[PDB]
Structure formats: C-alpha cells, structure tokens
Design a protein around this ligand. Structure first.
Ligand SMILES: *[C@@H]1O[C@H](CO)[C@@H](O[C@@H]2O[C@H](CO)[C@@H](O[C@@H]3O[C@H](CO[C@H]4O[C@H](CO)[C@@H](O)[C@H](O)[C@@H]4O)[C@@H](O)[C@H](O[C@H]4O[C@H](CO)[C@@H](O)[C@H](O)[C@@H]4O)[C@@H]3O)[C@H](O)[C@H]2NC(C)=O)[C@H](O)[C@H]1NC(C)=O
Ligand SMILES: *[C@@H]1O[C@H](CO)[C@@H](O[C@@H]2O[C@H](CO)[C@@H](O[C@@H]3O[C@H](CO[C@H]4O[C@H](CO)[C@@H](O)[C@H](O)[C@@H]4O)[C@@H](O)[C@H](O[C@H]4O[C@H](CO)[C@@H](O)[C@H](O)[C@@H]4O)[C@@H]3O)[C@H](O)[C@H]2NC(C)=O)[C@H](O)[C@H]1NC(C)=O
Ligand SMILES: *[C@@H]1O[C@H](CO)[C@@H](O[C@@H]2O[C@H](CO)[C@@H](O[C@@H]3O[C@H](CO[C@H]4O[C@H](CO)[C@@H](O)[C@H](O)[C@@H]4O)[C@@H](O)[C@H](O[C@H]4O[C@H](CO)[C@@H](O)[C@H](O)[C@@H]4O)[C@@H]3O)[C@H](O)[C@H]2NC(C)=O)[C@H](O)[C@H]1NC(C)=O
Ligand SMILES: *[C@@H]1O[C@H](CO[C@@H]2O[C@@H](C)[C@@H](O)[C@@H](O)[C@@H]2O)[C@@H](O[C@@H]2O[C@H](CO)[C@@H](O)[C@H](O)[C@H]2NC(C)=O)[C@H](O)[C@H]1NC(C)=O
Ligand SMILES: *[C@@H]1O[C@H](CO[C@@H]2O[C@@H](C)[C@@H](O)[C@@H](O)[C@@H]2O)[C@@H](O[C@@H]2O[C@H](CO)[C@@H](O)[C@H](O)[C@H]2NC(C)=O)[C@H](O)[C@H]1NC(C)=O
Ligand SMILES: *[C@@H]1O[C@H](CO[C@@H]2O[C@@H](C)[C@@H](O)[C@@H](O)[C@@H]2O)[C@@H](O[C@@H]2O[C@H](CO)[C@@H](O)[C@H](O)[C@H]2NC(C)=O)[C@H](O)[C@H]1NC(C)=O
Ligand SMILES: *[C@@H]1O[C@H](CO)[C@@H](O[C@@H]2O[C@H](CO)[C@@H](O)[C@H](O)[C@H]2NC(C)=O)[C@H](O)[C@H]1NC(C)=O
Ligand SMILES: *[C@@H]1O[C@H](CO)[C@@H](O[C@@H]2O[C@H](CO)[C@@H](O)[C@H](O)[C@H]2NC(C)=O)[C@H](O)[C@H]1NC(C)=O
Ligand SMILES: *[C@@H]1O[C@H](CO)[C@@H](O[C@@H]2O[C@H](CO)[C@@H](O)[C@H](O)[C@H]2NC(C)=O)[C@H](O)[C@H]1NC(C)=O
Ligand SMILES: *[C@@H]1O[C@H](CO)[C@@H](O)[C@H](O)[C@H]1NC(C)=O
Ligand SMILES: *[C@@H]1O[C@H](CO)[C@@H](O)[C@H](O)[C@H]1NC(C)=O
Ligand SMILES: *[C@@H]1O[C@H](CO)[C@@H](O)[C@H](O)[C@H]1NC(C)=O
Ligand SMILES: *[C@@H]1O[C@H](CO)[C@@H](O)[C@H](O)[C@H]1NC(C)=O
Ligand SMILES: *[C@@H]1O[C@H](CO)[C@@H](O)[C@H](O)[C@H]1NC(C)=O
Ligand SMILES: *[C@@H]1O[C@H](CO)[C@@H](O)[C@H](O)[C@H]1NC(C)=O
Lengths: 317, 172, 172, 317, 172, 317
C-alpha cells in the first residue's frame, strides 16, 4: 500500500511553431511577434511637427513658387513631399539638386530674412508669364531678376557681411536666355557672368544662350545655386549680366529635421515612428514595413515574421 | 530539450493545468489531485520576462539619413548608396534571425531546466520513502494522505516520520 | 562539456563502436558484448543535421554592386567605397567567427546531453537492482543473461522480476 | 554474483580540432568546412549569359571601336572585361567614366536603335586615321562626326521626341582640336559649343583647343557624354561646331546584369557563383576566394577556414 | 542558473573560502573543517580564461579611413559618410551588447555546472554509505574521521570498507 | 552516529553586477571591463612616426607656405593637424580640397623632386606681399608664378616624361586676378587659359577675373589643382597666361599613413592606438573614447561600460 506522485508541465491544444538553432519548426506553448509588418495608413501629426508639402516640393517652397507661397517662413520636423507636386514658375534646374534638398530639409526651417542689397544701375523684380501669381506676371518670391535700366547693366559689385552669430544660407541663380536677342534685350551684353564668393570660396557661372524644350511657355532656363556664409565672413557678388539675385538669406539650423516622400494622409494621432506607408508602433524591435523611417523606429529587416517563444515546448499528446 | 524532462522522460504535458506551468499530480488513499507549483512557474516566467525586457530596450532613433529610392539613373554615387543600405539590411536581418534562434533554443532549454529542478528538489526531499519510476512519477512507499501530499508540495514533508513504514514496504 | 558525461565521468570513448554514437557494454554469466543505442544516436545526429540545414539556407544573391579594386588614385569617393567594403567584411567575418564558436560549444554540450539522457533513462529503469559505480557503469546485483541485458537496452526490463534477488545481494 | 553494464560513446583515432566559446583548440570526432577557399579556375557559362569582352572594354563596345564591332546589339548577364583590352580608335576621355560603365553594365544590353537626325548644313560621317576599319579611315560606329560643308557650319537645332514606353540612352561627344588651324578647317568657327538638353537638364560643353600627348597618331581628343531621355520628354541638341553627334539611342533596361574584371577563361559548365578567380560552388555559407562576386554566392570573410563540429568531443584515450 | 546548484539547492556561498571556488565542509567525530577542491576550481577558471583569450584576439588595425567630423555643410556625400559610420557603430555596439549577454549567461551556467559535477562525482562515490539531504550536504551513515573525509575529497574513498556499518545505520 | 559532508562554492562581500540574456542586473563574484573609456591625454610618439603639423595644415606644407618651410621633404605615419593652423600666403581655394588632403596623407610623404621645366619666354618666381618669407616678398615654395617678360606671354607648350618606375604627383595652379588691369599687367592677354594633360586626362581651367573679399591684403585668388602621371605617360602643359606652374613632383607612395585632427600634445611613450583624445591602450576589445582611431585599436561602441563576468554568481546570504 502506497501512493503515486507525478511531476508534470502544462500544455495547450493550439501551440505555435518557432525556430531554434536546431529546428526549422518546433511547437512551443506561446510566442510573440518581433517583426512589425502593418501600418494604420496615416502619418500621425504627433509628436513631430509635420509639414505637408501638398502641391509643393521643398525646393519650390524655398524658391517661392507662387502656388507655394503658403510655405513661407515655415518650420518642420518632417517635410512630407507628395508625388502630386509640380513646378509652376520659371523652368529651372539645380546642379546637385539632391544636396540642396537635403541640407535645407536637415536644417528644418524656411525662415527668410530680407536684406537690402545695393542694386544701383539695374531694374529689380523682373517677372514673367511662366510664373503667374493670380493672373499677373510674377517671379520666384525669394529671387530678384535684375535686368538693364535705361539701356545699361553696370558692373555690379555688392557685398553683405555676416555679423550675426549664426550661419546664412543664400540662394541665387543665373538666367539662360533662349536667343541672342533676349540676351541683349535683358542684359545689353553679348555674354554674361556671375561670381559670388566668400573668403573660402568662389563659384562662377557663365550663362549659355541656346534652345531648351518648351516648358510652361518658355525655352529659357535658370540654374539655381547656393552659398553659405559663416560668421565673420562676407558675401561678395560681382556680375556683368544674367544674375538672378538673392533677396536675403535663410538661416541654417542643426537638429532632428528631415524630409520624406509619401502619399500617406496626415492624421491626428501620436506615434514616434513614421514610414512612407504611415506611422507604425515601435513596441516590436524589428519591422518589415519600409526601409525608410523617421523617429524612434524598429530596425528594418527582410523577414516579415520572427516568432519569439514565450513558453515551453508544447507536448500535447 | 537539453535536460530530457520536457518532451523527454515526461511523456507529455497536462492540458488541464491552467493555473501554472509546472505542478504535481497524485493518487493516494483519498483520491487523485492536481496542484500547480508557483516556485517553478515564476522562475521560468521571470526569466522569459527578463529577455522580453532586454528586447524592448531598442535604441534606434534615426532622423535625417540617406535617400533610399531613386527615380533617375545616376551611377557611381547611387550604386554606393544602394550598396550601403543593402549591406546594412542584410546584417540586421542576420542579427534578427540569429537572435531568435539563440533565444528560442535557450527558452526551450530553460523551461526544461525548471522542470528538472522541481523534480530533483522533490526527489531529494522524499529520501528513502519513494522511488523514481522513470516517467516523472514517484511511488510513495507509505500511506500519504492529502496533508502528506500537501507537505511535499509545500516543502514541509518530514521523511523521518514515515521512514520506517516506507523502508519496510520497500525491502520485502 | 557542460553535463560531465563525455570527457567527464566517462573515462573515454569506444573506438570499436562503428555502428552508433552511444551504446552499451556488458559483462555477465554468458560473456561480454557491445551494442549501440539508436535512440540517442538519432537524437544527436538529428539536431546536428538540423543546424546543418539552418546554415545552407543562405540568401546571398548579389548582382551589380560597387567596384572593389581601383587602378587610379581618386580620393574621397574611393576612400568611402573602400571603407564600406572593409566595414562589411569585418562585420561578416565577426558573424562567422561568433557563429562557429556558439555552434561548436552547443554541439559539444548537446552530445554530452544525449549521453547523460541515455544514462539516466537506464538508471531509473534498473530501480533497486543496480548501483552507479561512478564511471558510467552499473553493477547489476542479480544474474542477468543476454536476454536480460537485451531487455535493458530495448526498454522492456521488468525490475520486479529480479528485485528480491538483487535486494538480497545488495544488503548483506 | 551479478553483472556489469557500462554506458559509453564512440571515438575515432583521427579527430579534428575546432573552436568554441571556451577553447582555442578542442578535438571533436568530425567537422565540416564552412569557408570556401578554392576555385576550379574557369567561369562557367551557365546559368548566366556571359559575354567575354575579349579585346574590348564595355565603353569601346558601346562607342563602336572597330575591333569591337562584333559586340553590336549584344546582351549579357555578366560582361567580363579582360586586362588585355585596348582602345584602337580616336583618343578619348569620359568624365565620370565609372558611372557610364556602371549604368550600361547594369542595363545589360548594347541594343542600338538608329534614328534619322536632321543634319542639314553639315557633312556627316567624319573619319580619321586613328580609327581604321580594315585599312580605310573610319570612326566610332555609334558616333557621327559632323564637320562643315561647302565652308560653313550652321547653327544646328535638332530635336528628337521619346514617344516610346521606355527610356532612351543617348551617347554623344565633343571634339577637341589640337590647333586653331584644325578648328577652322573642320568647323569654320574660332570657338565651338554644344548644348544637349531635356526638360530637366542641360549639359553644355565648350571645346578647348590645345595640345595633348601623342596617342595613336593624334594630339587631338574627344570627350564622351551621355543624356537619358524619359518618355514624354524630348532631346534637343544645339551646337555651333565641334559636335560629335549621336546616331541613335541605346535602350536602358533594369535587371540583374553587371560587369566584372577577370582574366579567367570561360568554360562550359554550370555554377551559380562567379568570382574573378573563376566560378565557385555555393554549398558552403562563407568564402575566402574574392570580395568580388556575382550570383548566389557565399558571403566573403577574411578567414580561410572555419570548422563546424559535426560530432561529439573525441576522447581517444 | 540552469543546473540549480548555485543560487539553487545550495543555500549560499562560503565567504570564508579564499583558496578555491568549490570545496567541502564536514562535521565528524573529530570536529569541523573546510577544504577547497582544486579540480573543479581549475575547470571553471580554465574555461573563463579560455573566453578571456578568445576576446583579446581582436584584429582591428585600421589606418587611413574616412573623415568623421565636418565643419562645413556639404550635403549628399557628407550624408552618406555620416550614415556609413553611424551604421557601422550601431552594428558593432549591438555585437558588443549581445556578446556580453551570451558570455555572462554562459559563464553563470558553466560555474553552476562545475558545482553540480563535483556534487555528482561525490554522490556516486559514496554509494550506499550516505544520503542526499537536498541542501548540498550528505549525511554519512558511519564513523568517518579526518582521514575518511580526506579519502572522499582525494578520490580514494573505499565504500566497501564502511558499507556494512552504513547499511546497518541506514535501515533500522 | 555518523558525519555530515557539505558541498559548497565561494562568495565575496563586494560582488559586481553584469548583464545576461535573462537579467538586466545580476551579481557575480568578479567582472572585467571590456570598454575602454579613458585616455592618458598625450599621443605617444611610438611606435608610429608622428609629424606634428603645429601651425600648418598638410596642404600648406605641401604648397610651401613660408611658415611651413620646416615641413619640406618630411615623411610620416600620422600627420597631426592642429586647430591653431592658419594660412599666411596667397589666398587660395582647392576644388575637392578633401580629396587632395586625403591622397597626400595616405601617401605619407612630402618628398619633392625638382625638375627643370622649359619656361622660355616668361619670367619665373613671381612673388607677392601676401606671402612674406622673413620680410621680403615671396611665394609658395613649390609653385612658380609665371608672368610676362619684356611685354609678352608666349604660348607655353612644355612636356615632362615619367620614365621612372613610380608615380608622379604634380601640383599646379591658376591665378585669378582682381581686375582687368592686373590681368594685362601680369599676362598681357585679356583672357588666360591653362590645359594640363596626360594620355588619359585633360583638366582645363579658365581664370575668372573679378572681386573676392580682402584676405591678407589681396582681393585676388589662386585655384589649386593636381595631376598624377603614370610611368610611360607624359605631362603636357599648354597655357596662354595665368598659369601657376609646378616646380617638380611629389612621389606618391602606398602604405599605412593617414591624417588626424587633434589638439592633443605629443608625448614620448609607446602605444599602438591613437585617438584625437590621445593614445589609448588596446588591451580591451572595445572603446568609447572616439570614433576616430589610428593603429591597432579597440572597436568603437556607443556603450561606455560592458562588464564581462569573470566569476560565478555571488550568493552572499
Ligand atoms: C529649335 O527647334 C525647336 C523645335 O524643334 C524650337 O522649339 C519650339 O518652339 C516653338 C515656339 O514657336 C514651340 O511651339 C509651341 O508649342 C506649344 C506647346 O505645345 C505642346 O503643348 C500643347 C498643350 O500645352 C499641345 O497642344 C501641343 O500639341 C504640344 O504638346 C504650343 O502650345 C504653341 O502653340 C500655340 O502658340 C503659337 C503661337 O506662338 C500658335 O501658332 C499655336 O497655334 C498655339 O496658339 C507653340 O506651337 C515648340 O513646342 C518648341 N519645340 C521644342 C521641342 O522646344 C526652338 O525654338 C528652336 N530654336 C531656335 C533657336 O529657333
Ligand atoms: C607641344 O610639344 C609636343 C612635344 O613636346 C608636341 O607633340 C609632339 O608632336 C610630334 C608630332 O610632330 C610627335 O612626334 C611624333 O611621335 C611619334 C610617336 O613616337 C613614339 O612612338 C614610336 C612608336 O610608335 C617610337 O618610335 C618613338 O620613339 C616614340 O616612342 C613618331 O612616330 C613620329 O615620327 C614619325 O613621323 C614623323 C613625321 O611627322 C617623322 O619625322 C618620323 O621620322 C617618323 O616617321 C613623330 O615624331 C611627338 O611625339 C609629340 N610629343 C608629345 C609629347 O605629344 C605638340 O605638337 C606641341 N604642340 C604644339 C601646338 O606645337
Ligand atoms: C567691390 O567692393 C569691395 C568692397 O565692397 C571692394 O573690396 C574692398 O577693397 C578695399 C581696398 O581698397 C578694402 O579696404 C581695405 O581693408 C583692409 C582690411 O580692413 C579689415 O581688417 C583690418 C585689420 O586687418 C581692420 O582694421 C578693418 O576694420 C577691417 O576689419 C584695411 O586694412 C585697408 O585700410 C588700410 O589701407 C588703405 C589704403 O589702401 C588706407 O586708406 C587705410 O586707412 C588703411 O591704411 C583697406 O581699407 C576692403 O576691405 C575691401 N572689401 C571687401 C569686402 O573685400 C572691391 O575692391 C570692389 N571691387 C572692385 C572691382 O572695385
Ligand atoms: C502569449 O504571448 C504573450 C507572452 O506571454 C507572456 O510571457 C509569459 C512568459 C508570461 O509572462 C505570461 O504571463 C505572459 O502573458 C502574451 O502577451 C503579453 O501579455 C502580457 C500580460 O498578459 C501583456 O502585458 C503584454 O502586453 C503582452 N505582450 C505582447 C507582446 O503582446 C500573451 O497574452 C500570451 N498568451 C497566452 C495565452 O499565454
Ligand atoms: C564528417 O563530415 C560530414 C558530417 O557528418 C554528417 O553529420 C553527422 C552529424 C551525421 O549526420 C553523419 O551521418 C553525417 O555524415 C560528413 O559529410 C556529409 O555526409 C553526408 C552523408 O554521408 C553527405 O550527404 C553530405 O554531402 C556530407 N556533407 C559535407 C558538407 O561534406 C562526413 O561524411 C563525415 N565523415 C565521417 C567519417 O563521419
Ligand atoms: C577580477 O577580475 C580579473 C579576472 O579574474 C581572473 O579570472 C578568473 C576566472 C581567474 O582566472 C582569476 O584567477 C583571474 O584573476 C582579475 O584581473 C586579472 O588578473 C590576472 C591574474 O591575477 C592578471 O594577469 C590580469 O592582468 C587581470 N586582467 C584584467 C583584465 O585586469 C582580477 O584580479 C580579479 N580579482 C579578483 C579579486 O578576483
Ligand atoms: C493642389 O493641386 C490640385 C491639382 O493640381 C489643385 O486642384 C486644381 O486646382 C486648380 C487651380 O488652378 C483648379 O483649376 C482645378 O480645378 C483643380 N484640379 C484638380 C485635378 O484638382 C488643388 O487646388 C491644390 N490644393 C492645394 C491645397 O494647394
Ligand atoms: C585579341 O587581341 C590580340 C592581341 O591584341 C590579337 O592578336 C593580334 O592580332 C593582330 C591583329 O592586327 C595581329 O597583327 C597580331 O599577330 C596578334 N598579336 C598578338 C600578340 O596576339 C587577337 O587577334 C585578338 N583576338 C580577338 C578574338 O579579337
Ligand atoms: C605657431 O604659431 C604661434 C601663433 O600663431 C606663434 O606665436 C606667434 O609668433 C609670432 C611670429 O610672427 C609672434 O609675432 C607672436 O608673438 C606669437 N603669438 C602668439 C599668440 O603666440 C608661434 O611662434 C608658432 N610656433 C611654431 C613652432 O611655429
Ligand atoms: C550703393 O551704391 C551706390 C553706387 O555705387 C553708392 O553711391 C552708394 O554709396 C552705395 N551705398 C548705399 C547705402 O546706397
Ligand atoms: C510600404 O510601401 C512600399 C512602397 O512605398 C511597398 O512596396 C510595401 O509593400 C509597403 N509595405 C507595407 C507593409 O504596407
Ligand atoms: C530638316 O531641316 C531642314 C532645314 O532646317 C528643314 O527644311 C526640314 O523641314 C527639316 N525636316 C525634315 C524632315 O527634313
Ligand atoms: C583570387 O584572385 C585574387 C586576385 O584577383 C588573389 O589575390 C587571391 O589570392 C585569389 N584567391 C584564390 C583563392 O584563388
Ligand atoms: C626649350 O625651349 C626653347 C624655345 O622653344 C627651345 O629653343 C629649346 O630647344 C628647348 N629645350 C631646351 C633644353 O632648352
Ligand atoms: C574625446 O574627445 C571628443 C571630442 O574630440 C569628446 O566629445 C569626447 O567626450 C572625448 N572622450 C573622452 C573619453 O575623452
């Protein structure tokens, strides 16, 4: 006569398969998912300050494309560029477009400070069909198209000191006329030249008159360039025609700002992690939603699922 | 796994145990019963909660990085940007695959450990009053009522009280 | 390794066992013999085959990448391309070195486990009819012919049949 | 009276040493190699379509160097460039040579589609000593050397629309004469100029007359440039001399194609992984053959051997 | 950890043992004593020294690399250089964090192993002359003077010499 | 009557906490630090040959800024650039400054070999206020400012063969005058031009006369360029004014040399690993001192401490 005492462990009828060093598939009592693979579909407007570019790229907002006027002096943590975006001003190109877009997006501000450059000898605020503001001829709001006055364009030699305690970002350009008639009609000289410079640097542009395909009414073009002036340095512009002058500077900041291409709608919610697919929770360590992220995000991996066992091996029968 | 208790010398789990991960089942002069062991359940659950917390620690806050989609053919620089992102994703994908394989192997083995620890703690406790049948069960060689079974589960079993009776039943 | 059986309380391996990884050696009234245990051999071999399959899974199909040899001095861009490839190779070289150290340590320990599991399964089976001499061998306290040794290896040994004889030989 | 039953494990007389977390050298019963360190020596022509460049670089095959004429309209998964390769046409340079080589190799095709550009006013198919086809004067097969006709070179203004549903790759160039005599003899103007353009872009080249060292009979040079035209865009070329005109386009594809520098002989066999040393099996997860690979390949590591234990610890005695 | 000896069925460590990592404490007819076990101490220390040597192997000799500090805003190329270094540091930081977690978990478990191995080696040695009380101690069922305790620690204990006396004390 | 034999392990009263897979904090008997987080503060001058740039950047030492004359023909394993560094010669810019700095630092030598270029027709060794050597007008020691002689600047066409068994690094420049008066006074031609070339390459610079801000007395500038000549190739310079000629070559080496920005003092000691913070021991596998390292160094990680358990778990009571 005696008794029996058995030692045992629990089990569940609906176990889950996980991977180990030894086994491609082994059933455990419970597991949890480590790969985030879904999104709500909206980008939460909290906690980051989100600026919907809507119909405007960052570059067009910077230059001052008339349909981008609402973006003047704005700040952002994340600038969201939409694929609908279009230019509706003077046809332009930006050599090293990607770098200018990156540095302005990283700075995170469109703060523009007007400065009174000394443009004696030429007529300011040149405008054009290609850049309507309403129904009147206009131009990029942050650019000043200088053309001859009373039939001459004198050797401009203008300076601007950076005596402030921050960096200045100056945006300027060069006009490329379509024909020689245009060149002399606007600048009165058969060949122009633009030399902006600092104590470190000197970027000189020669305009190249010639034909480019029809874009928004014009075969002419403008090339966009930038110069950053450090405290104690000075901006010097010397031009004998074709100069698209700056009206001031943008202040460069350093911080956590960036830019993202997304068509996802902006929603009123809070989420630390943003993807082009929309915001995602960051409670899991990994994610398969998008290689592009912003904020406190799970790390992107190629797997769409990784099951972490949270229970013993399941031995039902 | 590595200790041979779970999925090993124990035949299978008890689906009717919904109040603990490890426990006791008995048959005596008063009937049969089942009782969970809280010590071993907490031990396993605490270590698994420990690795859960080690994994939610992640510190991947990134802001302005590099572009990862391109609409134009550019060449060398784009080749390098693509190669960098592809290289990074492959290494992190490997880290994730290796991490779950290590963690899951260790999880299975640690639960196997806790099962064996409860067994051994019980085995040493009974001393010469019981024998291991090899299937995770002990034949208790004396009358052992519910209080007696209770005393084993609760750690207050005094083997000296039953030793003479059990020895006489053991050895002819 | 971790369990102390192989390279531990077992003195050394049996070079004459060419039909299994674990097994039995006996001496009785009929002679001496050697027989492999298929259960434990398959257990170890299956887990090692499991990690072999986990390693042939590799998904490294790469096509157009970056250039990795240069005949001209270029500077910054070349510096970055070289740094990227050097960085990638160092991290993958580390992954490979860490992987074999983990895998081999686990392999040695898992084979040590299987040895101990066969031992314990056998120990519990014999009950009070044998004693552990500490060198991986049991002294069986009763006449145990080839069928009896067979019954132990095959799992059909009935300890109740020999219990009285073994107890009498054990205890003076 | 009793019996003895001993538990044991196997052993082998020729164990192998492996590494663990704890031990620099420990003997196990068996191991397998995880680092591939050998090659057969040939590049298998299966399963990838291999194109032996032989005496020709990809760029010379693209331009149409006469000894590369056999490479017209070819396709490849892997273009193999040989170190024997040489140019035997007009001396040239390609600014950003590496990028052009990469994008054509990634496209994986030399498909050229001839298009009838409207070259009224100049004489086509200018040729030269430096570029013999047989024993007669010739030129790059895909380039059209335009020079003056009846002593003038009129302002060329030629367009070409991309109305197809794929991208066009246009290859063109600029001639750099050695002396002022040459410049006026060929182009009749003291200074040339070439402006190819799209709706996005404009690359203008000024030719710089001057001396360059003797190469294949000439001190003159040509600079090679490219322009990619997207569907709905248009190619516009405006040039007042020195234009090396395109004869058509190459179609750009996207896919798995690439280029590799190797002197390894091409063999008839099948292997997924290709190195400059030759093809290697991919049954092992790692390899020490070459950092350069193509296809389904083991990952390159610095170790030449990594032993994975496939048996227990070996305890012989 | 995984074996349940240290921080497990052993209640706590012996702060007065300053000549070894594992050892014996006894009480007999001659008094009480403490003696370290050199076998198990060397076993643990050797494996830990082994992993120390595996970690001082590092082969990170780097010379001309890429620039990692910048005084001017440059854009794309600088973005890529920063991203490459940030990517590399995150992956190596992960390698270091994972390495210590694996190593320390394995260290704790391997010392737990060595403790249990010394226990089992001693348990099998005593045969039927002692019993496990479950707290890391054996009740020795016979007179066992200092030479007798010595014989156990030194591996020369002959259980047959005391077997009759111990069996008689065990079984009523 | 019997005896008691207890099995046990040691313990210490002052345990240390470490991390495991399972535990955020667990006490072990002993641990060792794997992250190096401190520095002595000096850069050890052994075993690497260290060259303190002191008041000179590498570029100024290369060009021959007078206060950098002590750096002529020097070699280094590590060139240490100080933040005190300044230029005190002609104001200059270097397009792709970073690349030139990198390749010279990687070469590890300032060995300059003078060569007798054939400058018939112009006057050599032009000097300037901005570049005093002592109290007399001087110039960059490795550059030769060519200006007109007896009122003309003839079409220079000079060659230099690389018949040696190593690579030649040639440093040259272009002068940018402030005004048209200057241009004709020095070069006698309204527009200059410089074309250095090899069999592979051709870099042509047009000087752009105009205003730049006042730096060390001058509004003029110089742009610095380089050309590498391979064995069997030849250097050809053709210039009609504004050429800042080379006086010879630097020999390019390949090796273990580099450059580092640091204000750390140079000490007499031995240490394999160098950081901008100073030398650090490399006995630990990881370090948190600086992402910038040189030599046999621990790998940089973000953690400042990582405790490796070197003993069992500590169970005091
Ligand atoms: C070098 O050669 C190129 C062409 O080979 C010249 O560039 C052309 O310049 C003419 C301007 O005279 C352009 O013609 C204009 O095209 C406009 C755009 O048409 C497109 O878009 C509209 C919808 O927006 C569609 O309806 C149309 O099918 C096209 O898809 C037209 O809208 C213009 O027509 C209107 O204005 C003119 C008055 O000027 C009227 O006669 C028309 O009836 C209508 O009211 C106009 O026809 C042409 O597109 C340009 N082509 C290119 C490729 O750029 C260069 O000028 C030349 N260079 C030099 C130096 O001569
Ligand atoms: C600026 O200055 C440079 C030189 O300083 C001038 O460039 C030189 O131009 C002349 C052309 O008159 C070149 O001379 C030619 O060199 C050929 C190549 O010779 C090399 O290769 C062959 C084997 O292929 C070897 O035998 C030889 O040793 C060299 O290694 C020769 O083959 C030519 O000779 C043949 O033709 C001429 C007829 O023209 C006959 O007189 C000869 O006997 C023989 O039949 C020829 O001599 C010279 O190489 C160029 N040098 C460089 C460095 O480019 C520029 O022209 C000048 N600029 C201006 C504007 O004047
Ligand atoms: C386009 O326009 C710019 C200016 O808008 C012109 O550039 C200026 O050129 C004049 C030269 O005539 C420069 O004036 C000189 O500045 C020197 C530097 O002064 C700075 O540093 C000193 C300390 O080193 C400080 O004391 C001072 O406050 C400044 O911080 C002065 O040292 C010079 O003065 C000395 O020399 C002159 C004689 O030439 C005497 O009259 C003085 O009393 C004193 O002895 C001198 O004044 C000026 O700095 C330049 N500005 C810029 C922005 O470059 C371009 O020339 C013009 N382009 C054309 C084509 O005309
Ligand atoms: C199965 O998945 C998770 C994991 O179970 C947890 O881990 C065990 C080791 C033990 O701690 C259990 O008590 C836990 O439930 C469970 O989801 C988590 O549940 C906890 C507590 O209920 C909750 O706070 C967390 O938010 C959950 N975490 C996640 C990532 O979802 C889940 O409930 C388990 N289900 C079953 C039936 O066991
Ligand atoms: C020693 O190396 C490998 C590994 O042995 C295998 O792994 C063991 C765990 C067990 O599964 C053995 O039966 C295996 O042989 C052996 O090479 C492999 O052999 C298998 C089967 O024979 C074959 O299919 C594979 O192609 C081989 N793999 C490789 C990478 O070569 C080898 O035969 C072993 N030799 C000895 C003597 O044990
Ligand atoms: C605590 O930290 C280290 C580690 O202890 C070593 O590792 C043990 C497993 C065992 O091998 C001990 O004997 C070791 O001391 C000790 O520092 C090392 O000490 C050794 C020998 O004394 C010396 O050669 C090394 O230079 C030291 N290494 C480092 C990285 O400092 C230390 O002495 C230990 N202290 C105590 C009280 O245990
Ligand atoms: C964003 O852009 C869309 C489309 O470009 C605008 O919608 C057009 O607005 C124009 C204004 O000139 C109207 O003529 C059209 O009726 C609209 N067309 C379409 C297809 O929508 C829209 O107004 C813009 N919205 C904002 C907020 O800027
Ligand atoms: C590849 O190139 C080699 C060497 O350039 C060619 O061999 C030469 O062919 C030329 C043709 O003009 C002959 O004059 C020589 O006799 C050959 N010389 C040498 C050294 O081989 C070969 O013909 C080319 N092969 C292919 C397939 O293009
Ligand atoms: C390094 O530079 C410092 C500062 O530029 C030099 O010290 C100056 O030397 C100038 C020489 O013209 C003296 O006029 C000043 O008295 C010094 N000023 C300061 C602030 O130190 C120093 O001589 C240079 N040392 C070396 C070794 O080149
Ligand atoms: C602006 O330029 C004019 C013409 O050079 C000059 O007379 C004037 O002093 C300058 N400054 C201001 C503040 O007008
Ligand atoms: C996220 O969007 C990308 C395209 O931007 C798409 O390829 C991917 O499948 C999407 N993933 C999820 C989880 O929505
Ligand atoms: C080609 O150019 C000539 C001259 O400009 C012109 O007359 C002709 O119409 C153009 N088109 C065709 C198809 O010839
Ligand atoms: C492969 O070729 C490279 C040179 O291309 C050589 O350095 C390396 O040693 C070769 N390796 C093998 C395994 O052949
Ligand atoms: C140098 O140039 C002059 C003028 O062209 C020429 O007469 C002379 O032969 C050249 N060579 C030498 C070595 O002077
Ligand atoms: C090393 O120097 C850097 C700046 O160069 C500083 O940010 C960092 O804190 C320093 N670290 C140590 C350990 O001195």
């Amino acid at each position: 006569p005696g008794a029996t005492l058995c030692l045992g462990h629990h089990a569940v009828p609906n176990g889950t398969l996980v991977k180990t060093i030894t086994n491609d598939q082994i059933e455990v009592t419970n597991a949890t998912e480590l790969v985030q693979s879904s999104s709500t579909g909206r980008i939460c407007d909290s906690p980051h300050r989100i600026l919907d570019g809507k119909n405007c790229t960052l570059i067009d907002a910077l230059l001052g494309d008339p349909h981008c006027d609402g973006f003047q002096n704005k700040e952002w943590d994340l600038f969201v560029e939409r694929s609908k975006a279009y230019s509706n001003c003077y046809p332009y190109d930006v050599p090293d477009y990607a770098s200018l877009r990156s540095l302005v997006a990283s700075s995170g501000t469109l703060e523009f400070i007007n400065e009174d450059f000394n443009w004696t000898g030429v007529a300011q605020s040149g405008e054009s069909y290609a850049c309507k503001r309403g129904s009147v001829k206009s131009f990029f709001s942050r650019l000043n198209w200088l053309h001859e006055s009373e039939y001459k364009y004198p050797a401009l030699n203008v300076t601007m000191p950076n005596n402030g305690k921050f960096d200045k970002l100056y945006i300027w350009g060069v006009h490329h006329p379509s024909t020689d008639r245009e060149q002399t009609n606007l600048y009165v000289r058969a060949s122009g030249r633009v030399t902006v410079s600092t104590k470190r640097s000197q970027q000189t542009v020669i305009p190249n008159i010639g034909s480019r395909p029809w874009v928004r009414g014009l075969s002419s073009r403008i090339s966009i360039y930038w110069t950053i002036v450090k405290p104690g340095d000075i901006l010097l512009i010397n031009s004998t025609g074709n100069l698209i002058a700056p009206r001031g500077y943008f202040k460069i900041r350093t911080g956590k700002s960036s830019i993202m291409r997304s068509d996802a709608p902006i929603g009123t919610c809070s989420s630390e992690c943003i993807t082009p697919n929309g915001s995602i929770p960051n409670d899991k360590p990994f994610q398969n939603v998008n290689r592009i992220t912003y904020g406190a995000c799970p790390r992107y991996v190629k797997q769409n699922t990784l099951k972490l066992a949270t229970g013993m091996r399941n031995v039902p029968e | 796994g590595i200790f041979g208790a779970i999925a090993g010398f124990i035949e299978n789990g008890w689906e009717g145990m919904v109040d603990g991960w490890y426990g006791f089942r008995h048959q005596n002069s008063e009937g049969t019963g089942q009782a969970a062991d809280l010590k071993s359940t907490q031990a396993a659950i605490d270590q698994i909660n420990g690795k859960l917390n080690r994994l939610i620690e992640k510190t991947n806050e990134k802001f302005h990085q590099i572009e990862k989609e391109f609409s134009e053919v550019e060449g060398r620089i784009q080749d390098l940007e693509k190669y960098v992102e592809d290289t990074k994703i492959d290494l992190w994908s490997y880290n994730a695959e290796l991490l779950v394989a290590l963690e899951n192997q260790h999880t299975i083995d640690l639960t196997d450990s806790e099962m064996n620890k409860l067994f051994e703690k019980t085995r040493k406790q009974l001393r010469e009053n019981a024998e291991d049948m090899g299937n995770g069960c002990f034949k208790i060689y004396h009358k052992c009522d519910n209080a007696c079974i209770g005393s084993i589960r609760n750690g207050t079993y005094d083997h000296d009280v039953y030793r003479d009776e059990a020895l006489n039943n053991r050895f002819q």
